[PDB]
Amino acid sequence: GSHSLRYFHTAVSRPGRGEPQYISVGYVDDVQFQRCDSIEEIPRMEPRAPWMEKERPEYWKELKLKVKNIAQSARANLRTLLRYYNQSEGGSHILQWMVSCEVGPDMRLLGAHYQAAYDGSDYITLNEDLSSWTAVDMVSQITKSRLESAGTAEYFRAYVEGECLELLHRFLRNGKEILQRADPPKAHVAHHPRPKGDVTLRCWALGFYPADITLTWQKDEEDLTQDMELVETRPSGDGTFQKWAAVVVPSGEEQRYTCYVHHEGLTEPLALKWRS
């Protein structure tokens, strides 16, 4: 339960030949729905999810205008920023911003986000009250001042309550089979003998959706989270994810260890031990 529509945008000031100078991707929860570009000022749009085939042409028509517009502003801001930080003219700079809105399990508006970064670092962020901005230095304080005088927050608020809400609800209703699901993880403990006589126990969790999961190993009732090796959750590539957590244990003492998997697709957490 609880869903979110999110866009990640990136503008680059010295792309290269055949590389976009603007690119944005949209997601509804952990599923990507589209990709937008601008290579040499020519917008491109591509669907990446099933429910997009049920999107009437009035959608792609307005988007193309939005991409051209945003691509145009982005290149302007890059130049302005470069001038404001007094940076030299021949560098490769990135401006990134995320825009999102989420609704609760009862489908009401929970909140919305707007944040920018210049060159990999926060730059400006819109507050939870959706009216004040938090800046991080004198340059962004200049920006904060301008967006505050101009009244810019009210315009994002309009967008949130308008297009964002509209697209979320629609994508959820038309993408139902995909987004309003929760596939449970396939878990198992693997056993690998190290050479000093000891063994690695790897607790696997495969094929789950959403990506949010918790694998924790325990000795008796001792939480081994600081001492266990963990990989960040990774995409299997078919819309599902995987992850594994390993601990090293002396041979013979294997039954002492338990793996716990917590996923919203599971009815109750699984508690696996090595079998055999």
Partner: peptide, 9 residues
């Protein structure tokens, strides 16, 4: 799909 004019619009 929104962009606020960071600087000088």
């Amino acid at each position: 799909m929104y962009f606020i004019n960071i600087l000088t619009l």
